[PDB]
Amino acid sequence: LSNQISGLNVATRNANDGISLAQTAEGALQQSTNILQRIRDLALQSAN
Amino acid sequence: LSNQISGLNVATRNANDGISLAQTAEGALQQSTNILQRIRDLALQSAN
């Protein structure tokens, strides 16, 4: 049981690192979405 | 929805630009038809 609980603690910690990495990726993806919106705006302006 | 909103705003801006262009062309057409009016006056007084 001690081995199991230690494994679960280290696994929850690794999962915390994973969710932080995923949130960083999600923020970068949000920034790419904003860039794509700006691109569509400037492209429809490029119709001119 | 955000992309659609942005596209509609830039489309309305292009629409105002086109309305202004057509209004300038309309003013030029009014001037030309006034000149043609004066031309007919000069031609009929040229009956002499």
Side-chain angles (χ1 to χ4, degrees), chain B:
Chain B
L1 273 172
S2 45
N3 310 120
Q4 180 174 351
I5 295 285
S6 315
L8 267 72
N9 310 121
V10 57
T12 60
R13 305 326 295 251
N14 197 24
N16 319 296
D17 273 298
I19 290 176
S20 54
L21 171 151
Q23 180 78 11
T24 317
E26 187 207 276
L29 290 203
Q30 173 73 346
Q31 296 295 332
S32 46
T33 177
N34 177 30
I35 286 294
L36 285 181
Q37 185 79 45
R38 185 52 57 184
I39 284 291
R40 182 175 290 176
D41 307 284
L42 294 169
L44 289 173
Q45 77 194 69
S46 85
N48 72 86

Side-chain angles (χ1 to χ4, degrees), chain A residues 3-44:
Chain A
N3 298 327
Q4 297 161 259
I5 70 184
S6 315
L8 319 185
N9 310 130
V10 302
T12 44
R13 182 163 298 94
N14 200 22
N16 280 321
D17 309 281
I19 67 184
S20 46
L21 185 146
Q23 291 279 8
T24 317
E26 172 56 7
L29 265 291
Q30 293 165 36
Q31 297 297 323
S32 47
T33 75
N34 309 307
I35 288 298
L36 289 184
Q37 306 145 11
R38 183 51 56 185
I39 288 297
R40 177 172 291 181
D41 259 346
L42 298 173
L44 268 170

